[PDB]
Amino acid sequence: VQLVESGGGLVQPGGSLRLSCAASGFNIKDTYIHWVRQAPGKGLEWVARIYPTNGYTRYADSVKGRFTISADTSKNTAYLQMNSLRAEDTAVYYCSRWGGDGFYAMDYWGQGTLVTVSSACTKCPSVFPLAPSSKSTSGGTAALGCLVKDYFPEPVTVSWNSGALTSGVHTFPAVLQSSGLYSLSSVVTVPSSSLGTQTYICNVNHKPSNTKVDKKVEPK
């Protein structure tokens, strides 16, 4: 059983966007499909629901008259058509099913898709190394990282050594700078003895601008 959302991204105020929720491992005709959203740093808010077999739908008062939910049963996919988007509609949008023997709760959720309602435009991130130095050591342990700066909209993902380095990694929550652009650092603590011997590369991904950067972090 899997729910996979797509279609999220940057849209101007007053604009329109259609989210998709591709289901697999079950038939959407047998369950109800819900849309639940979450504004940055806020709680969960149910948005809409559909019974795909007969198309009966229900909406939250906050989206009524602007959002429409629908389904293509042959494609096993549900949709969220959003018209007249407002700044307050900026949120991660999740789809969910009401399924099982007698659960009648949301047992399976999708990963979510971020929708940013803003008049600002797309900026890829600038990636710089946070080089390990004598000022970045602490008794056999060094810190190094990458500064992922001046991007819009969210999100960016960071990994180290294509996913082979995960322990000691800290990718900080992005912060909005005064310029209206996001910034974050991803750091990792490693053995000091590994500095001139192990290779460290941060893999940055910014899907909103189709950017993928692999920066090698060398000591100096």
Binding site: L44, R58, A60, A105, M106, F128, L147, S185, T189
Partner: protein
Amino acid sequence: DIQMTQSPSSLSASVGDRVTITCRASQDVNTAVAWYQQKPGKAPKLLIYSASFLYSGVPSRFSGSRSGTDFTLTISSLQPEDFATYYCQQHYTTPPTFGQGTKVEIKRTVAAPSVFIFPPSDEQLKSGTASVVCLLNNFYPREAKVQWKVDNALQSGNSQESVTEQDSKDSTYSLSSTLTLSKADYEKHKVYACEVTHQGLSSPVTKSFNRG
């Protein structure tokens, strides 16, 4: 709209403690209540369905109970991996409503941060801007004070902080502070320092470098 009044908003407890989160439904919803656990940056996961049934695969330390319009989620023995925001949800009537959420933090022994300072890269300086980063790694409690000093002058309004969510294994936090200056302003000074004040430190720790 049937309100789900969740309490408390935040909660802090030691490993092994019995934690109780309550949701008072403003109306009778019989047993049509579910509980979800949400880890940072992840989708909510179902814990309890039908007010008291444990969802398959969820650890036995989680339990749900109904008492009229009040519902409870109990973690009998709080583990470090239980750091998350918990949400109740009624599905008796449309709209299905969620509680405001409960942020559960794990109490642990005091841990001083390891402090690291990072000068701006030559690549960024070439591009005409300078970001200086100070890292406070794996500390507890979350409360920490970071001050920037550029040639002993206390900086104000030119830095931003970011704090990681509590670690699921060691219950610590990490903090980054970024000081931003133009390349021109940056080259007018020599010592860039970050002074850290934390409960685990006897006296404030200073990490610094001399430009060049």
